[PDB]
Amino acid sequence: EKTSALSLSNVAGVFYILVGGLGLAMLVALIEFCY
Amino acid sequence: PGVFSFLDPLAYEIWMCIVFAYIGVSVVLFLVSIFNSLWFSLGAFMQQGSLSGRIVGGVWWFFTLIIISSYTANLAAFLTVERMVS
Amino acid sequence: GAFMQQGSLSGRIVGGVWWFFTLIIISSYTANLAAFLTVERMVS
């Protein structure tokens, strides 16, 4: 019963869904700067 | 106990990984909209998260939702293991 | 009115660090409470 560790091998699954939202934000930022 | 014990249920590599997403979102609000813009960005940071700027806070809100949930879940797992325990 | 709603560049970093500080306490209060519900301790 020692670890009880918190393997970030899958915490990367949260980071991979966020950067996609930042890239999706840069596509809408260009259609708003032109329209 | 200790201050090195103030970095446990999130990995030694996750506490230094959450900070990359904090500065990564405050720089997108710089591009979808400097001393007052950074004041607005974490004015928008602790309040969870334009159409380009709305999807910034909508996706950032789900990202920080899992970490604070993966922190409270892993912290309780130790306290249960440090519970019985004999 | 800014405390109930969690937490000006100088005033922004105040409500941000306070938001992380209160985030850990409410996460440690819920985690420590959830561990007793599992293993009901008996005090002699």
Ligand SMILES: N#Cc1ccccc1-c1cc(-c2ccccn2)cn(-c2ccccc2)c1=O
């Ligand atoms: N170590 C330790 C410790 C001792 C007394 C009370 C709590 C802890 C503890 C604190 C933390 C922690 C870490 C960062 C921020 C806040 N708290 C973590 N852990 C812990 C949890 C899971 C596995 C190993 C240690 C802990 O066991």
